[PDB]
Design a protein around this ligand. Structure first.
Ligand SMILES: [Mg+2]
Ligand SMILES: [Mg+2]
Ligand SMILES: [Mg+2]
Ligand SMILES: [Mg+2]
Ligand SMILES: [Mg+2]
Ligand SMILES: [Mg+2]
Ligand SMILES: [Mg+2]
Ligand SMILES: [Mg+2]
Ligand SMILES: [Mg+2]
Ligand SMILES: [Mg+2]
Ligand SMILES: [Mg+2]
Ligand SMILES: [Mg+2]
Length: 114
RNA sequence: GGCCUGUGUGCAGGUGGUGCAUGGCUGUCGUCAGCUCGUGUCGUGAGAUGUUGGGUUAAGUCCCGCAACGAGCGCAACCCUUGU
């Protein structure tokens, strides 16, 4: 089950890979074909994986787990920040901090100070 | 009991040695700005990061990105004097 249509996917252009100069060989099983130095990902595998992620996230919300949203690239900072704020869910989009969750005791005092 | 004159007794007395056993105190590097730790992470391991690189400063002063995030001792200032 998906909520995003194929035509919308192609219009968005999420099927493009990086150029042939920096492509990861491990993504051979996903990249479909090359066309002018650029790669294309297998859309059907994309929908299948999206479906699996959808079921997992549904299970997560079902048993009540908190999800952390992380993204630091310049382009998507505002998008992820707005989406996380609307969902009311912690996030970060400016700069990743060293082991904030792993070393949680130190950040605990930082939160109390805040 | 306070006292001291004599016999003692335990005992006082030593600038006598030993600053390569020691306390305390002190000179220097140098009033130079650097010096450590908690958590985590890389390696296995000595260890490293953090403290780096760009910029800036009298200074580890501050910003930038980074497996680093913070904390401690330093520095700045809090003392005195001088200048209205
Ligand atoms: Mg004597
Ligand atoms: Mg003697
Ligand atoms: Mg001596
Ligand atoms: Mg020194
Ligand atoms: Mg390990
Ligand atoms: Mg280090
Ligand atoms: Mg280093
Ligand atoms: Mg640093
Ligand atoms: Mg240092
Ligand atoms: Mg410096
Ligand atoms: Mg400091
Ligand atoms: Mg000071």
């Amino acid at each position: 089950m998906a909520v995003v249509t194929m035509k919308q996917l192609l219009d968005s252009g999420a099927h493009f890979g990086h150029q042939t100069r920096r492509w990861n060989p491990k993504m051979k099983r996903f990249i479909f074909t090359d066309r002018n130095g650029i790669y294309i990902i297998d859309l059907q595998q994309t929908l299948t994986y999206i479906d699996k992620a959808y079921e997992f996230v549904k299970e997560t919300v079902a048993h009540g787990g908190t999800v952390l949203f992380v993204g630091t690239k310049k382009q998507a900072q505002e998008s992820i920040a707005e989406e996380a704020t609307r969902v009311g869910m912690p996030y970060v989009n400016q700069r990743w901090l060293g082991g904030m969750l792993t070393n949680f005791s130190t950040v605990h005092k930082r939160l109390q100070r805040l």
